[PDB]
């Protein structure tokens, strides 16, 4: 439940702080009745490194099903809006996260297609999938996506 650190091929770090990990793992689809959860990844750009400081959480505003999710709530943008204000422009939107009803997850064709069409990544972005036992995390640059590696 501490921090998680992921690295790319250039050793650019992607840091998920401990409070974010606990929030993410609280939406693990541990039961067969559990529906999909998700939101935005919000954090800090420090050179080529990224630090995930906050996330937006699911609300009843969102369409949540067992193997599908529609992040529609207006509160997601407000979290990005307010964190930008409180941080004087240092805590910014960085990507998207959602859950998968599987132990060790990987993105599907719908996940990849929606990411290339959804997140604009003129600057680096992060995608995250919360599995029942572990996390899949990837980095987006324009239209290209690549899985990160867990730092030894």
């Amino acid at each position: 439940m501490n921090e998680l650190v992921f690295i790319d091929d250039f050793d650019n770090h992607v840091v998920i702080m401990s409070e974010v990990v606990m929030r993410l793992n609280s939406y693990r689809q541990t039961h067969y009745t559990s529906t999909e959860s998700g939101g935005t990844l919000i954090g800090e750009r420090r050179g080529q490194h990224l630090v995930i400081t906050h996330i937006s959480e699911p609300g009843q505003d969102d369409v949540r099903n067992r193997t599908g999710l529609e992040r529609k709530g207006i509160h997601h943008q407000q979290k990005v809006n307010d964190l930008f204000q409180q941080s004087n422009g240092f805590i910014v939107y960085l990507g998207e996260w959602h859950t998968h009803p599987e132990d060790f997850p990987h993105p599907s064709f719908i996940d990849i297609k929606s990411w290339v069409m959804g997140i604009v990544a003129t600057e680096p972005m992060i995608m995250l999938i919360v599995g029942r036992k572990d996390i899949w995390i990837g980095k987006k640059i324009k239209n290209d996506i690549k899985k990160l590696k867990k730092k030894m």
């Binding site: 750009r45 420090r46 529609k72 422009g89 240092f90």
Partner: peptide
Amino acid sequence: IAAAPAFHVSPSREPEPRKINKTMVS
């Protein structure tokens, strides 16, 4: 320590809040 290299670079500021895409399906 594992995350220390990221915190050794000063953060970047952005001009305005980002406009997240409406309806993110997955």
